[PDB]
Design a protein around this ligand. Structure first.
Ligand SMILES: OC[C@H]1O[C@H](O[C@H]2[C@@H](O)[C@H](O)[C@@H](CO)O[C@@H]2O)[C@@H](O)[C@@H](O)[C@@H]1O
Ligand SMILES: OC[C@H]1C[C@H]2N[C@H]2[C@@H](O[C@H]2O[C@H](CO)[C@@H](O)[C@H](O)[C@H]2O)[C@@H]1O
Length: 347
């Protein structure tokens, strides 16, 4: 029918939103404003309070200030994934070691399964992250969730995205990811496809990826040109290298970028949506590069303005939000479904 989910399409999902009613605070809708890293001492940038009128986004959710722990919101999000045809939810994971995290992960897996969506983990740079505790956490996630019917596998293997993987040396990665590594996961019950973050130029990234023994790489950033890896004109040659070296390239595409509510000094990273023309151009480049899998930045990183989740016009007494302009609130979901079809036609 040209409506089914694609299980080589990964959409980055954030589960950190809270409401007073469910979580005790409108978590993440309220957010600290980041100081300017180039702006000198004594900055008191303040905070966005997460009131109805003033949230930590330049856009405003159709679903309002929702809780990521609200089963009714999770249902709606799964229906949005179905509309987008995105078969894999790539869940931010911060190793919070708290019961509220554990509950939420189970709710997300349960809701996903009702719609045949799959879940993989996006392993964030949690405190003291290193290859030993990464191994222990991969073991824990596979043990806890691996038998859940919504847990993602590709040809029998779990898949993890590793954000800011460059913070760990290749010599450490090798211990986990080479078949001969001291603490290898290869050939164990806990083997997985490990997808590292390609940031800068090939002269740095090629040996990093090879020496770390990652299975593949992704680029994350929604803003074109933010890094070498997020410059789509590089994707054909990145894919060629990937193919020559047995690596899986999963370029990241997004619909725009703007984070100036939380990072007022970061305006040079703004990428305008232009009624969908930015998203079209980026998605087309990923497909043209001939890749096997695509990642989408993001479902709902509202702080960074990269979300495809529906947004609505809103003007409050405190802020005039951006919105999808000439497009309707669900436009980026249905345009994702368009591109997933083009991707499949290519595969
Ligand atoms: O432009 C802000 C930027 O913040 C985060 O990225 C930081 C770091 O995590 C990245 O590895 C490097 C890449 O050069 O850039 C930043 O320091 C992300 O949240 C990103 O989406 C955001 O644009
Ligand atoms: O998921 C990878 C990163 C992508 C983007 N969401 C940011 C990063 O998280 C940092 O920035 C957000 C605000 O944009 C803060 O809420 C987080 O506390 C911070 O770590 C992700 O790591």
């Amino acid at each position: 029918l040209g409506t089914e989910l694609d299980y080589d399409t990964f959409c980055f999902y954030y589960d950190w939103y809270g409401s007073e009613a469910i979580d005790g605070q409108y978590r993440h809708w309220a957010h600290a404003i980041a100081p300017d890293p180039n702006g000198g001492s004594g900055q008191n940038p303040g905070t966005i309070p997460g009131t109805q009128e003033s949230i930590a986004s330049n856009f405003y959710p159709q679903l309002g200030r929702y809780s990521s722990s609200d089963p009714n919101i999770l249902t709606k999000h799964m229906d949005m994934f179905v509309m987008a045809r995105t078969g894999v939810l790539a869940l931010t994971w911060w190793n919070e070691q708290d019961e509220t995290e554990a509950k939420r992960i189970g709710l997300i897996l349960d809701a996903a399964d009702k719609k045949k969506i799959k879940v993989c983990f996006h392993l964030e740079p949690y405190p003291s992250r290193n290859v030993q505790n990464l191994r222990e956490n991969i073991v824990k996630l596979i043990t806890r969730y691996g038998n859940h019917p919504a847990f993602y596998r590709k040809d029998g293997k779990p898949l993890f995205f590793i954000y800011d993987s460059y913070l760990i040396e290749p010599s450490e990665w090798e211990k986990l990811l080479s078949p001969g590594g001291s603490i290898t996961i290869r050939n164990t019950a806990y083997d997985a496809l490990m997808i590292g973050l390609w940031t800068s130029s090939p002269t740095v990234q090629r040996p990093f990826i090879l020496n770390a023994h990652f299975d593949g790489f992704y680029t994350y950033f929604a803003a074109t040109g933010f890094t070498y890896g997020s410059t789509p004109t590089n994707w054909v040659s990145m894919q060629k290298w990937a193919k020559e070296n047995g690596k899986i390239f999963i370029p990241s595409v997004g619909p725009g970028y703007i984070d100036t509510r939380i990072r007022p000094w970061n305006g040079s990273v703004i990428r305008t949506r232009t009624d969908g023309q930015y998203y079209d151009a980026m998605y087309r480049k990923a497909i043209e590069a001939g890749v096997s899998a695509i990642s989408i930045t993001s479902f709902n990183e509202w702080h960074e303005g990269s979300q495809i989740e529906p947004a609505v016009p809103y003007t409050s007494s405190e802020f005039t939000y951006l919105d999808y302009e000439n497009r309707e609130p669900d436009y980026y979901l249905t345009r994702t479904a368009y591109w997933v079809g083009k991707f499949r036609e290519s595969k």
